[PDB]
Symmetry: C5
Subunit: 340 residues, 5 copies
């Protein structure tokens, strides 16, 4: 008596057609759809995508499924019979591969109300493409989106829109190894315009922000300490070559070991990012110290009072000058990549 | 005569409906379910998940499957006919992908008792999501959970609960490369509250604890020895520059090679973890030794008895002072990350 | 009334045969096909392939599907019934694995016009093979192609050709971590000639160009600075051994650390590429400096005015000579790998 | 006439039931099963498993398949009809995922003899779990097993046992990158005892032994040479600081580069293994040399004949003493990890 | 009229049996099969296998498919009906996993001639196992094979043999990152001998040869230059300790950085290969230089004319002697691993 009523309502007896939309040749059916995120993030810059495991619930009205000769309000449909009912041809416009779940029971749910409203909730795993710009690495902000588009019905037939109360929700307690999923989501429309017509799609923009604290005390702070070690070489008496050449070349070797050793941890983009500018300029100052003494030793190597006054003068200017240049670069750097 | 009785009991003749729950419009069916773990652990911080291969056994009562005209107690059902019987819509609320096993025979088992009790044991492989907080790395304790939730039946229809005697069991002899699976499991309820209603779920919490002994004698001990090597530089006569500058800068280069060389082994989280604080402070002391001599050489470089007494005094304070500071940090560190 | 007309037109009543081509034993059917690229690039030199997610639309004429007793022009066909219609046996001649998409609905679309024209749009994910020549790395240009070939029909039966207006389109906003997808695509024919006959195929050539800016300020610039550091060793007075031997051997160790440290980032090809020539020659000059002083110290070590004039002369030639040789190599290098 | 006899023998006419075991309510059916290994080894300590591609042949007796009205002895069954015959519910108790092979034909084989004997040979690919203990790395011996267990039939119904002549065979010419598959296999029983009853399983134990010769001349020999380089520092006159401090600290830096450079090659276990003890003790001796001179320079730095006799005495003891300590550790090490 | 003749010839009307071989109880059917290679090579020493994407065409004679009442010669069969015809049970004896292709149409082709000849061409992707011996790395030659074996028919029923004109072909333009696919293929028989009987198989041997040019100018040449840098230490006056100890220990540190830095690029085999012998002996000579001076300084440290003549004599022998030993090893090495 429960399940032999859906065969009466969608079988060969009644004239329900599974591949004809509700309100056919009439108003476009409204689909109120909302997303719950269970798991989030296998965020990779190698393939420029991420993964998300969602419950997708989508609700519409099918007037040829209304009924009154059955006692309760809601009447659910078995997941093996979902080819017997109309469903929207929703797909995800930026997916790179996705699947259902079928463990211990097929994880699908459809529920027809007494009104004729249909609630359809599924649980799917998604590999969604979001392009990334790592020009501001590590202090970069990513925006990975999630588009929901009709595949074959235009907006004169099918209209997608978000739920009013809460569209996208995220299960609390999730943790990303790189990013922080911002709590404010950005719901937008993305309505497609092709020669076939206007196709509906609605997008959810997720804001990601990279944590920087590892790259501070593993890349930035040790390089800044090595630059200070090259600044030590200016408070040393001249013509003492092996205690000032060896210091200045050892800071070069330690900066080179710092930059090359930190190469396998940073991503494999092949363009200039904001940590490579720090390593490059912090190499140019450490190199600039030994190049400075390479000038000073040749100036004072000839031998003249002007030569010691000229050598002393160069050191006097240099001792003060290079922390000022590193301070101007140090202000312009963090304003440029951090402030904006 | 054995298998032609289940067709008599669940066929077109008898009125058994496969998608109507037992005790329909009555009490919620109890599901006594328990888990045996065969394999455990492909634990990854990159995707924040693990893998587990389980036998899931779940037992319930179906009163419209009781019988008396068959000689033995237990009557098993073929795995090809499992669509002919009601099964709970159990799913795992934190899975990221999961599958059955079908090699040489589909690894499913259903057994209907003479009482009407149904035993249903399957063998499935799971990729379950557990978020991790590596702030206390390596001396961190993880808690990876395992939730068992009804998908479409509320608690007025279906109730999950663990077995009384032993719910979760783990096959002895398993070994993880990183963690130690604790023998005490934490069985809890997790009962979900949605606008549809209260959905049953039961969770098993597994406690994991990371082994640290590699990071002692490969990261902690060599860094502590390099800090002692920077402490050697204080028991050296002053104005002997290349035997004390070169020592102090070589300890910097060896600490930098130690920290950058140990970078590819540690995980790829982008925030401050407890081994990065050890490498950072053990870099600040080794740097602080050469910065200390960079003060001492300029104090004693001018030339005055006060200058040698002032230089000697600084060395006298420093020789004693830096093992005290490393001892205070060394107590606060291991209490802070190890004791709590 | 909509969907019971396609059963009238392609069912057992009408004599439509699904595996007989249109215009059978007549003219070859024209297939106007065009490609829209959603996602592009998991470009790997390890397996010599890439990935692309496309909409493939292909249009042909089937004269035994024309109709007039139905009100509208276009009449769409359900994706479950696509075995009931003829489709071209198009495959991709350089694929290494590929699949469809079926999430929330099978992502296929077929539309029969009143004229008898059939539009067939699908959405498939592709792993396409393109062989790469990394001899000019990093300043190399790749050309990865995309072939569309008939599988069993010769050109006397089936002819593929691109759409006139726009054949290949790429969704704007895509970003590759290594390359830049050039905006000018190269549409060609590739017509196959076998003993069975001439098989149609049409190819789209995509031009990729590698970004170099990382390898400038991480590989090229630090090596050039180390070569300048070996040039510093010539403006030093002779017979001062430990300040000139230790400098020259420390530049060797820093160049060796630069070359070996940059090894895990560059690809795993086992042949000579254009960055290995830079690292090799920038090792031969840094080695050539200490080998030069290894000559100079033995010339001036014996003791004669000719010996100091001969030593001074060698330094005089060397001080000027090695930046000229590095300038000739530096012109020939960037013309040879960058200009052509 | 060949294939229309199996439809006579297992069809709707004859009373063969596919899901009722032979000799039902009688003796347990014997399954003589044997394994041929084609490929072996994707041995990973990350997931604690390996892969093996086998032919599994299993033979049993089915008395209701005996026949006499057909000319030849053996009568084979088509792989599409294997649901029409009883098969054992064998599974592998330590698999983590496994599949069949179906390329160009489904790779299954069943052959019914005139006696009623059934031979069933399949070809399957296996990911089998074996836990590993890398405490003795590299000179460790692993034992990876392979269990064959009935899934739903107890030992009162089904009994597995190996073939007498040769149970497990391995195709000659296989090569592992890490291990050596020992030629002596260890056939055992593993009979399971559950509350349902005794379930049959038979296991094959494979003995693996790791090759060590890479870790000799890449980890052990260079570290031993660096320890000898620290032993060089004792045959040097005292108060010659920069030629003995710089040697002793350069051996520390070279040992640190050796240990940190060899870190990415060794596995990612997080506990103390036998190569980490070698690197740790070979770091403690190289550190102990400079700590020894850090004592000697302070003893002889004050100035007294007793001080030079005390300094000379310390060197005299140390010159002899540290190769004896490294010899005692060098005997205890290789006996402890290599002999047992 | 085209496709309703194959139903007349292989349907329920005619007595064609799909699982009975042609010429049953007669001569063994000949299968003339040939292979075209589209893509080749995901060659991995970790799993000891490679990948290849082939067209497999196989031709045989089926005398109960000959016809004369149809106008043309060739009559093709639909890929959905391939279970209606006999096909050989060919499989690949060294595959580790393999699949078909089904994109836009199932990529299979069968064509029945008027003679009764059947042509069957498919397109499959293969992971084929070839064991590798990296003892001669990098100058090693691999031989990866490809076996085609009958699964259930002996040689009294089915015989495989290659095509006469061209059996294996490779699509031009392919590029491997490591190897060079040799143009001369080695076609062989491999006929299997089991207790069931003789099973046919035919194999194609592919010869691979590794390119070495990367390992020359990245591993061999820099190590040889460091050995020359240790040869520089012999043309230096004795009793000049810090300019000859520091040189000789810096060559040790640079050789250690060269060997440990080149470790992550070379494969993960755990046995002695031919580049590890080069790095080991090039470490023993660089170590042997400082050990030589560690003898010389103790000989000349005591003080005697014999001591300076003995010291000078040792240097005199050593200056000449070590390039001779490196020349003997350098001849024996390249003859031993390169010539044979
Ligand atoms: C889906 O939503 C749209 C938007 O409200 C509905 O279209 C409106 O229908 C009312 C009828 O009272 C008109 O007054 C509006 O002008 C329509 N808005 C449009 C066309 O943008 C549409 O009816 C809804 N679909 C269904 C099946 O009810
Ligand atoms: C599942 O377990 C619950 C909990 O015991 C059962 O509900 C109880 O039924 C008894 C009837 O004697 C009542 O007295 C209790 O108040 C009920 N507890 C509740 C509602 O929390 C329920 O009957 C069981 N299901 C079945 C099918 O027996
Ligand atoms: C597919 O395109 C070809 C190329 O136009 C068509 O073949 C031509 O048919 C016209 C008939 O008016 C001839 O004059 C040309 O010589 C043909 N060109 C050839 C054979 O290269 C073909 O008819 C088209 N297919 C269909 C079904 O219309
Ligand atoms: C499977 O093997 C067992 C072991 O031989 C058989 O059981 C034996 O049957 C003989 C009958 O002559 C008894 O004497 C033994 O005591 C039995 N051994 C036991 C029960 O351990 C069994 O019959 C075999 N199965 C079949 C179908 O023949
Ligand atoms: C497959 O090839 C074999 C080898 O030629 C054929 O066997 C031969 O048949 C001729 C008949 O004229 C004999 O003279 C040879 O001695 C046979 N050679 C053998 C048995 O090795 C066989 O007939 C072929 N199969 C078919 C179906 O024609
Ligand atoms: Cl150094
Ligand atoms: Cl280094
Ligand atoms: Cl590294």
């Amino acid at each position: 008596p429960p399940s032999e009523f859906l065969d009466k309502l969608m079988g060969k007896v009644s004239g329900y057609d599974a591949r004809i939309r509700p309100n056919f040749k009439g108003p476009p059916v409204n689909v109120t759809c909302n997303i719950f995120i269970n798991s989030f993030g296998s965020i990779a810059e190698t393939t420029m995508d991420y993964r998300v495991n969602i419950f997708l619930r989508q609700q519409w009205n099918d007037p040829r499924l209304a009924y009154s000769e059955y006692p309760d309000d809601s009447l659910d449909l078995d997941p093996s019979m979902l080819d017997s009912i109309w469903k929207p041809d929703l797909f995800f416009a930026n997916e790179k591969g996705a699947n259902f779940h079928e463990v211990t029971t097929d994880n699908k749910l459809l529920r027809i109300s007494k009104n004729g409203n249909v609630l359809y909730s599924i649980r799917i795993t998604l590999v969604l493409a979001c392009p990334m710009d790592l020009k501001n690495f590590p202090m970069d902000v990513q925006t990975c989106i999630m588009q929901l588009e009709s595949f074959g019905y235009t907006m004169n037939d099918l209209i997608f829109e978000w739920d009013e109360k809460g569209a996208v929700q995220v299960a609390d307690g999730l943790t990303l190894p790189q990013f922080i999923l911002k709590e404010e989501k950005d719901l937008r429309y993305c309505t497609k315009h092709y020669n076939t017509g206007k196709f509906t799609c609605i997008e959810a923009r997720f804001h990601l922000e990279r944590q920087m604290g590892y790259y501070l005390i593993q890349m930035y702070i040790p390089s800044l300490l090595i630059v200070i070690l090259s600044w030590v070489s200016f408070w040393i008496n001249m013509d003492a070559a092996p205690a000032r050449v060896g210091l200045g070349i050892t800071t070069v070797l330690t900066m080179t070991t710092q930059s090359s050793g930190s190469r396998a941890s940073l991503p494999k983009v092949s363009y200039v990012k904001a940590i490579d500018i720090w390593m490059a300029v912090c190499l140019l100052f450490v190199f600039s110290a030994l190049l400075e003494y390479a000038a000073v030793n040749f100036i004072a190597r000839a031998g003249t009072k002007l030569f010691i006054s000229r050598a002393k003068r160069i050191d006097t200017v240099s001792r003060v000058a290079f922390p000022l240049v590193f301070l101007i670069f140090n202000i312009f750097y963090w304003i440029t990549y951090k402030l904006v």
